Amino acid sequence: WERDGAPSPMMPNEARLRNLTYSAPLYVDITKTVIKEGEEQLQTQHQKTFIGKIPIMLRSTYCLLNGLTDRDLCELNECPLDPGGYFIINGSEKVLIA
Amino acid sequence: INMMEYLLQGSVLDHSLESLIHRLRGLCDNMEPETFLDHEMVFLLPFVLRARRSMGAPWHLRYLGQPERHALVRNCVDIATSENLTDFLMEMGFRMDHEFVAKGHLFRKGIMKIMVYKIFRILSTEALSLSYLVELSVVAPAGQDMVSDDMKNFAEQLKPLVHLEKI
């Protein structure tokens, strides 16, 4: 999200350069049912309530560089040989050691 | 090379002087002192400058900085200049506020100099003060405490007639 509030896809190279966190918004469907004791219950469903952001491992199924051909990666300034498998937190490539 | 002076002043009554001149002449080494008549000015742009003419020597000007021990010392750079300086400093932009001629006699020493004189105000010479003034101006590059100490001994010799201190 830019300072003006306009969302835009975040490329991993952009995250690395701008010290951003490669994270994906997370939404939950939440059903709230209120029983007033008046013999009627009101059920309202909030669709896709934002609950936070999850850092995304690069080259995973949920990364922007998923299923992209080597030419597309080159156009995005990403090494096709780069295996991914790490997270970009504040622009720092973090790898989770097993 | 720049030198800062050691000077400190005092005044002497008229009747007193007749004893002082003989006192100073005998005490220090010299022959037949000279009466020095000079016409001094002061120039302000703050950078107070003093240009002195003496009645065929060239116009000698001197600057004294702000004072920096038993002595009064301020950085001084004295430079001899040829004639037609006054108009030169007019084209500089300096302005002359007052000018006074000084009359009297000066006696020397190994390094230090004694000059006894009275300040004359100009309009036409008038005696600003009835008593002369005496100082012990000493010029020495890279001033050190040793030079100032020697003045203390000499001043103590002259203490009885006139007691002088820096101001």
Binding site: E2, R3, D4, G5, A6, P7, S8, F50 | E68
Partner: protein, 252 residues
């Protein structure tokens, strides 16, 4: 403070951390400069309330993904207002929301009062009142909002193309210049311009959609759009690819 040099500026040194007279080289101070720092190479009630306000500000900012710089400006504004204490009678939550709005305005990415209310439990009326009081207390001012301020966010949330966003921005700016919408709120004018551009482009958005994102009633959008509709060809950019011709734009 070179002893032989009255009023001498001593140059700092990084090799030894000392200040040295430049004209003689005398070392005044041995290791006095501390090059390591010089060269960069039980809680009180008031403080607890301030901390709670900061936490609320961070929550509200993250709700709409506001940057940490705006958050910090909001924190500073809240500190100033809270210590000034002219708003001590007002809720800390309302003060925080108004400070967040003022911080957005000062940073040049204003959010509508409705947008701030959507993330704050405080109502729009209370937020506006606290905003006025905060402006008076700070003796400062905020630049008047313009239609172009909200175009980026509104178009991005509506997922409109960049060309459509440019067309909407140009339409709103030209309408304001021509004075076709006197007194109308900038948000309403921007919503009407966005509706015009969307209807003239392939990506068509309903009045309800635009009102939902912009915080403006479809009726208000209708009024503004009706005011700008007669001169739509004049308002539209010259090099705009009209999927729907300007003549055939919806009339309402």
């Amino acid at each position: 403070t070179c002893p032989n040099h009255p009023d001498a500026i001593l140059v700092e040194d990084y090799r030894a951390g000392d200040m040295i007279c430049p004209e003689c080289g005398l070392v005044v101070g041995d290791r006095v400069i501390d090059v390591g720092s010089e060269w960069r190479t039980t809680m009180s009630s008031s403080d607890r309330a301030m901390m709670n306000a900061f936490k609320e500000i961070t929550t509200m900012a993250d709700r709409i993904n506001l940057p940490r710089n705006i958050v910090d400006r909001t924190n500073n504004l809240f500190k100033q207002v809270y210590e000034q204490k002219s708003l001590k009678g007002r809720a800390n939550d309302a003060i925080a929301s108004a400070c967040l709005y003022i911080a957005c305005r000062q940073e040049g990415v204003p959010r509508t009062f409705k947008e701030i209310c959507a993330v704050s439990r405080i109502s729009k009326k209370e937020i506006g009142r606290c905003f006025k009081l905060i402006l008076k207390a700070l003796e400062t001012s905020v630049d008047l909002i313009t239609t172009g301020d909200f175009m980026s966010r509104f178009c991005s949330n509506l997922c409109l193309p960049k060309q459509v966003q440019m067309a909407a921005t140009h339409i709103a700016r030209k309408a304001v210049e021509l004075d076709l919408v006197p007194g109308r709120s900038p948000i309403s004018v921007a919503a009407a311009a966005i509706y015009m551009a969307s209807q003239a482009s392939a990506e068509k958005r309903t009045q309800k959609e635009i009102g939902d994102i912009a915080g403006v009633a479809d009726v208000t959008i209708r009024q503004s759009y009706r005011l700008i509709y007669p001169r739509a060809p004049d308002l539209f950019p010259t090099d705009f690819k009209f999927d729907t011709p300007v003549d055939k734009l919806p009339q309402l």
